[PDB]
From a paper:
The glycine is anchored in place by: (a) Nη2 and Nε of R342 that H-bond with the terminal carboxylate of glycine (2.8 and 2.9 Å) and π-stack with the guanidine group of R368; (b) the α-C atom of glycine is at a H-bonding distance to the N5 atom of the isoalloxazine ring (3.0 Å); (c) the amine group of glycine forms a H-bond with the carbonyl group of R368 (2.9 Å). Moreover, R342 is another conserved residue in GO (glycine oxidase), DAAO (D-amino acids oxidase) and SOX (sarcosine oxidase) that electrostatically interacts with the COO- group of substrates. In contrast, both C281A and E426Q mutants still exhibited similar glycine oxidation activity, and the [name] lost the glycine oxidation ability but held the same ST-F binding affinity as the wild type. In terms of conformations, the mutants showed no difference from the wild type except for the sidechain of R368 in the [name] mutant. Residue R342 turned out to be critical because the sidechain of R368 was misplaced by intruding into the glycine binding site as manifested in the crystal structure of [name]. Next, we performed coupled assays to detect the end product to see if it could be formed by complementary pairs C281S/[name] or ThiO/[name] (Fig. 2d (vi, vii)). No product was found, suggesting that (1) glycine imine (the product of ThiO) is not the intermediate for [name] (with intact C281); (2) the first-reaction-phase product formed by C281S is water-labile and unable to transfer undamagedly from C281S to [name].
Here, we report a noncanonical FAD-dependent enzyme [name] that adds a glycine-derived N-formimidoyl group to glycinothricin to form the antibiotic BD-12. X-ray crystallography was used to investigate this complex enzymatic process, which showed [name] has two substrate-binding sites that sit 13.5 Å apart unlike canonical FAD-dependent oxidoreductases. One site could accommodate glycine and the other glycinothricin or glycylthricin. The resultant product is no longer sensitive to aminoglycoside-modifying enzymes, a strategy that antibiotic-producing species employ to counter drug resistance in competing species.
Residue numbers in the entry:
A (entry chain C), C (entry chain B), D (entry chain A): 10 to 491
B (entry chain D): 12 to 491
The structure:
Amino acid sequence: QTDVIVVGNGVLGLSVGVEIARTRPDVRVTLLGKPARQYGATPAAGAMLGAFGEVTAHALASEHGRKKHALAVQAQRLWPEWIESLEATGTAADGRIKTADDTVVLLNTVGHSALDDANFAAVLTALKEANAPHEEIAVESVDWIDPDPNSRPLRALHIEGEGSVDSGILLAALERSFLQAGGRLHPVDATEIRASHGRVEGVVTDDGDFLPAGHVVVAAGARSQRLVAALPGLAHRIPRIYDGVGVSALVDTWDGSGPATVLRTSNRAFACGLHLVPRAGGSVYIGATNAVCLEPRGAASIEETVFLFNCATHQLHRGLNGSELRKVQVGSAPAPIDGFPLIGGTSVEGLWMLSGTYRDGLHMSPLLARHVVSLMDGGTGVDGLREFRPERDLISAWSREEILDDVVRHTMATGYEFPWRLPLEWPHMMETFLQGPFAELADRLSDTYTPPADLMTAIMFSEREQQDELIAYYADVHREWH
Amino acid sequence: DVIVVGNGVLGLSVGVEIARTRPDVRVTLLGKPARQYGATPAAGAMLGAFGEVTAHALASEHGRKKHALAVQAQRLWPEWIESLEATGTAADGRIKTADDTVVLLNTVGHSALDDANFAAVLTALKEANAPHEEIAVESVDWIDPDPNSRPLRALHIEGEGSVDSGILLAALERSFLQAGGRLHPVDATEIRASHGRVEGVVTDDGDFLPAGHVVVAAGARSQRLVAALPGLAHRIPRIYDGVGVSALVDTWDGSGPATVLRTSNRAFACGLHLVPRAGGSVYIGATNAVCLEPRGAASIEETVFLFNCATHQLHRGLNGSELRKVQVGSAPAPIDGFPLIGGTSVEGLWMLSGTYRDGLHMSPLLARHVVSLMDGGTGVDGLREFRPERDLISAWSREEILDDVVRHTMATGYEFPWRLPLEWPHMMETFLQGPFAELADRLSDTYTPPADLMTAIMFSEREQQDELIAYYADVHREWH
Amino acid sequence: QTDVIVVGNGVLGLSVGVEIARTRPDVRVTLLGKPARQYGATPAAGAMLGAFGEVTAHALASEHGRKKHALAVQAQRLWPEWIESLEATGTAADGRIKTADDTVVLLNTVGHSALDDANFAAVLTALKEANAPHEEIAVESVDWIDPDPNSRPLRALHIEGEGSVDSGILLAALERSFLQAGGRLHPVDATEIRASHGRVEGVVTDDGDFLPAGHVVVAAGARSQRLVAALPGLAHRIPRIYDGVGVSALVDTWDGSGPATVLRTSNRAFACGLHLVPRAGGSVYIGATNAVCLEPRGAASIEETVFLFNCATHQLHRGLNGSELRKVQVGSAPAPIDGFPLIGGTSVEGLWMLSGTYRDGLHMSPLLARHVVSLMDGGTGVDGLREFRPERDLISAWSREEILDDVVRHTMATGYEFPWRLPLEWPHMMETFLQGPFAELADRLSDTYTPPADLMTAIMFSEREQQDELIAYYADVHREWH
Amino acid sequence: QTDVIVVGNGVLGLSVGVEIARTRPDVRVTLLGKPARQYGATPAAGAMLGAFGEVTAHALASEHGRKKHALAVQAQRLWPEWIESLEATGTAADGRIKTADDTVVLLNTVGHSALDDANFAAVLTALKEANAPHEEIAVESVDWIDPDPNSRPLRALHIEGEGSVDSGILLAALERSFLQAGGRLHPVDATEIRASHGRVEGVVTDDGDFLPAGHVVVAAGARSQRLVAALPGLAHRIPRIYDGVGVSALVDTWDGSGPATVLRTSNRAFACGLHLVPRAGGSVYIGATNAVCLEPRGAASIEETVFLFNCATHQLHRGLNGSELRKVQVGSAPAPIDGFPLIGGTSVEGLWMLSGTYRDGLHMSPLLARHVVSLMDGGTGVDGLREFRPERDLISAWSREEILDDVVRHTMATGYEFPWRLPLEWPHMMETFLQGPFAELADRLSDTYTPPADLMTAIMFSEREQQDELIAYYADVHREWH
Ligand SMILES: Cc1cc2nc3c(=O)[nH]c(=O)nc-3n(C[C@H](O)[C@H](O)[C@H](O)COP(=O)(O)OP(=O)(O)OC[C@H]3O[C@@H](n4cnc5c(N)ncnc54)[C@H](O)[C@@H]3O)c2cc1C
Ligand SMILES: Cc1cc2nc3c(=O)[nH]c(=O)nc-3n(C[C@H](O)[C@H](O)[C@H](O)COP(=O)(O)OP(=O)(O)OC[C@H]3O[C@@H](n4cnc5c(N)ncnc54)[C@H](O)[C@@H]3O)c2cc1C
């Protein structure tokens, strides 16, 4: 066959499906996945087209982080034409994909200085380096916000051409554009990829059927590694992906109003963030908690919903307090164990992977789609996506020392973001007594690999058995690659 | 031919008792499976009698009568449950979720409510010779509060428990069908009557159903439906929406308490409680807010307040537990604070509504009462004051209500709990008294809304206040 | 006699004493007052040489306020030579009057946006209009501060040539400079001013003695009016002066360190402010609460000490938490009932008044001294200080409406400055329910006069009898002047 | 006559001085110490005559603790006659020593359940076992208190015949009674005790003089050991006494009122406690913080004053917020390194010690005085005070394991007593991460001795040099006694 199967019906699967169908009208492109989209990140995303807004001091302090940021800047440049090309297969009545053009980043004191002050400076620096249109503005000039004075921002940063989409209208427009270009939707799940003599044959589905193909693209979010790793000798060659459980909410505003821009903070403790994405029809999206879980989870915790609502009502708009909760949304950000995406070719001919995009995969989608389509066509794709090839040794983007400083900082930030009220001696006490146990965990896990902070905290508070299983995993990966 | 309008616990309870007692007569029950604004699905629910006692309630004749009826209702529940589970099988689930209740006293609230109400509960238990014990907090199973939010006193009440409201509704429907009842899943738009007699009910699909008996148990919609009939607009007390929020939570470890865990009733009939459920679930409730217009969704504030209280005052483990569902229902909130139970001036027209925050518990007693009246009996003796066609009851002086509304307002602060400069509470007490006194005087020379409704009126639009002055004036004309 | 008696040994008394003795070597100048300085504002002041730092939006919005600011800029220009002239009468071991040259103004969210944001903008505006040397700086570049992250500043403003003095070393240097110029210190209190046929004869002291003079200058701070008002028909001709009771503290720092600049916020609720003034020898000054009292009070309340210490440890330096409290200081800022100073001549020949300087009298002292000395010598003194003649109808600088908005704003600010944690509906509730009672008090007090906000809140929470006595006072003043 | 010198003018010195002068008309008794009473615990104490009020679960669980409680009950029986005998040397105008007969113990949730709930139960148990007159009462029936509802007590306990004295009037009555019985007050400090051939010769004073005597009693509070340890080979034979630095305050109440009983909580984190002791003349005493310091400190920290005032205004009476602060008091509770007093004879003939009474020495004073005076006369004194002889190996009353559990519990209690507001996961996190570092400190300090919790926390947060000096001290004590 020259037949192509895309495994997964999130934004990444459908984006790659659309680019393949449009570029090869000769070939049959079939996309698998069910309308339920169980643990789907895409439906739970607002979503922000985050590039400059996603900048942290920590990210920009590694080579691997500066490459990710560069790819996000490149992805930003594709969004206007990509949206035009998707709305062109529909009519006015289908709804607009774009919900805002611009973003305001707010700096308030409801957080750690060591994250929020460092990250605001890093965002300003990255905007100036990339010659992006932006302005530091008076907080008084930010429309709509009505924070608690004790939670108010004292600095604000307007970013032009960094906006948001309605993730639901984007999915509808992707499906529509996929069908329009000759794509076929088969609403079942893949259970197994079949390959022999180093070549893909096709995909077994969960109804027992077998679909033949010479090209399989895996974009099954957090299930992508488990699916490819079953193939011979790949178990320790594809980096593990965990579930980044994220909570968000849809709220009908007291008066039907909403902001004209995205409103956000910089990224906060363990990739949690506060943002408000505008929506049509008197709705706003608020997000977003993040927690790496070693097993999948389909429901918000009490703590996640309380923290999200408390931050939005104090830091963005007190009017949200009396506003109607329409929906609490939960999705799994695919969380790669080495903190970097899995994009491109495998050692198996015709087998491609598009996954581990964590908290910015929706934003990257048009760039990642174009990259994989160029590779499949004999091209080189996008420069700088080379380090993120799916079949690799675990990347070490930071020293153990840098990560141990980060995990303690982020731990303390869970306190300052609450915000807590404690005796002034207690924070220094906890900083000192956290360092030892995290240093001991990092040394015990592996001599060579260190999990990034988001994952290290989940491991710190996991069962002894789960820690032991990870020591074994890290050891098997060292054997395979050294 | 009997038509019951409404498919809540009250409608179905009366439907079941009619169908079982008069196999001769044809009983049709209206209402849709969606149960829009339905209180019953959002209730835990507690079989609250002693737990529902407040100092304020026990200080009026009307309050002492309500409490006595709640004690009487408690005695019916064991046989009523047995009679409803008997029409089903093991796989249908158990209606009863706990036999006993623990009342906790903590400092996350106003002394003027929580301390007074705990004493009142203890007093009422001793007066009724009810089996109970003040116990050491250390001996309360399961709870794991924040030390700063922990209880220092606890009260075990035997034979005051809880039901799964969802399994009760399923068992009522099933028992109704089994006794010959007919479920027609549409809403009533209009009651038809002429020459002082009910003819039947127009449905929202355009149809007309004839009957010589109509029982209105449509919760918070009950008055709006009967008040359309000639000269009844100012003879049936208004019912508003007591919007209540609760939640279903899957516990971190699948565990749950063996008893109900609760505080006494708090600001504006809000309360904190945990009702056990089967299958590693717990129910937590319950906020209350009187709204002049219906509302079908929880506010952010309601969800945050409910979750914050449960995680700090009951169990910190609930913080990491999975939210399965946020529930919203309308407690039917009668403008004079008392239920609407019994006959009208229109022959064959009965009303069963305005049961606010205890209607589920009362349901078997209220059902038996209305069925006895329909059969030519006298029903239950002290339900007489609550006949639906009446002048607005005045159970409290204006002065008592103005003290209550200021106390409850201050309690919204202490229940948060707030942290403010120590001069600010006394400042707010002084500056709240004037505006509430001015509102009560402006509303009517004779009627005073109870606190729960007065705060909703205080913060409503000028037009909504003016419409209520007109309503109160028209009721004075009609009855004096 | 040509003899001069100065009644009062605060900065104003001693400053005028020094300027009289130096300008008229012919005349005998005697200065009364005890070393205890009971209710003395001067010893309790840090003190800041505030000009740009004292700017508020409210001040810059009136003609009266723009004049006060201009006088403060003029006073600033006198301080270098005035200090040189006072240190010249001493030796190396006497210590330095000047403790800092520069001031950093900090903006944090531990307060009302309606005061702190407006006042920070007003300071920046006034600096730019005057072309005064200043820089908005990164908070990270502010030396020494170590705030609680949740209480930290996000903006900072360096003002060159706006500094501080040790008020205690200034008093010692003024006494010494007074003696050096021929002055006589008589350490007793005046009980009575004696006058007949419209001329001063002298002063009865509290030891029973009588001192004759043809010139008496009253600079007795908050006691100044009570002393002159006892003279015939003057009870309702000299505006009342109340006690602005202010609390500050001297702290020995954990490590002997201190900041090189003044550190301050803009003025806050009811003229409270948060500041740290450097001192020699491992000490710092922290201030300063303000509360108008209708009766004098010589001791700090619990609330004042807790509020002062809580603000300094959270907003300036957590190290102050473990630092040793050396002294709690209480002084009476002389609070004139119409909000303007009492400077110059009376209807009684040879009777002068120098008082009602509230919260800036130390900074103004060299200008106010020179002004009164020029008037006594037949000159015109400083232009624009003529409006503040002590014998006057109560000035009305603000509409009743402006004052009622101010008092409600400042009342709400006591909450945000705490800072309080409240349900989000409660602040709007309190704003609404405060308006009525303050409007009712203003109407009941007088048809013509309105007390400024700082005094109105003290009257609101005073006894019924004290309110009634003020209605009578305001009525008697209307009779006297209309 | 034979010469006796008492070194120290606290309650213990003067109590022993009074009993010697009255009992031994043969001997000439001179008592040293200045009216300043530098670091004096006695002037800073309220003070409560604590017996049942001082009971904790920890105390009642050891033989040593049940003995201390029994001695406190015995001391209580002496107070009525002792007061009668001291007031008899004065007149009506000298003031009453006794300020209350009864005590109310309050239980609120502003603290750790593991201390406050356990201690309230232990007090109730001890009262019932002794058949002591007491009643658990309704909180509504407690006179005077007006707490913040969120900080209010939910249980209260009236104890009859457990009261309080004005420590200042007790000191004045002791001095007066000492003079009346033939005692001599020499207001200077001892610098050195002189001894040769194993016998005391006398005392060198800080004015250079030498006073001869055959009997010297050291009751210099926290200076007692430093003074005796200078004598040959005694540096490691007399257990070190550190400074239990305690802060209290005198407050003039808003309305001149006060409670008729002592109002207290049980003892809280590191022997801090909250109490109100009635005083004459519209004053109340509030206390009392406690912190073991390795060096003396004569001034309150900001933290201590804020914590004391915050607890009293919220938990006892909101009226104290607007009340006038008259005095912040600091004293050194003599804190023995092994947690037991130093009472009786040394290896040096005529050298006695009466010290290390920490937080209950004022209550014990008449019993301890009678004991030492009986020993000096050839008697046996009080049975069970013999084990507290000053020249001893450090006592080990508690396992290392018991102390490590206590220090973690008390550390957590500093949080709950604040009270803090934190995310709900944080307290369990802090409990886990505190255990290791305290266990590591205890192991490193000595193989044999473990400091009690109050001292262990001070050592944990001391300088490396101070920890090393204590390892050396503990090692030298092991050498000396094994
Ligand atoms: C959050 C919450 C918690 C509570 N907890 C408790 C508790 O623990 N214990 C307790 O005893 N009580 C509790 N209550 C109170 C109790 O739920 C109510 O008092 C009682 O259930 C009211 O019953 P009802 O049948 O009158 O009303 P509902 O349950 O509201 O039933 C009325 C029904 O009529 C239907 N309807 C409306 N209009 C029409 C129409 N035109 N035609 C046909 N049908 C119509 C509605 O859809 C609805 O299903 C609680 C209430 C709330 C809100
Ligand atoms: C804040 C606080 C509250 C307390 N509350 C209570 C309570 O309610 N009830 C209770 O029973 N106990 C209480 N105590 C404990 C009690 O105060 C002490 O146990 C007791 O006062 C110790 O008496 P003392 O005479 O040994 O020491 P101190 O009272 O310290 O007296 C020692 C004296 O010796 C002097 N001195 C020092 N060096 C020399 C020298 N070289 N020569 C001469 N004199 C010297 C000192 O200046 C001082 O005056 C409290 C303690 C504090 C600090």
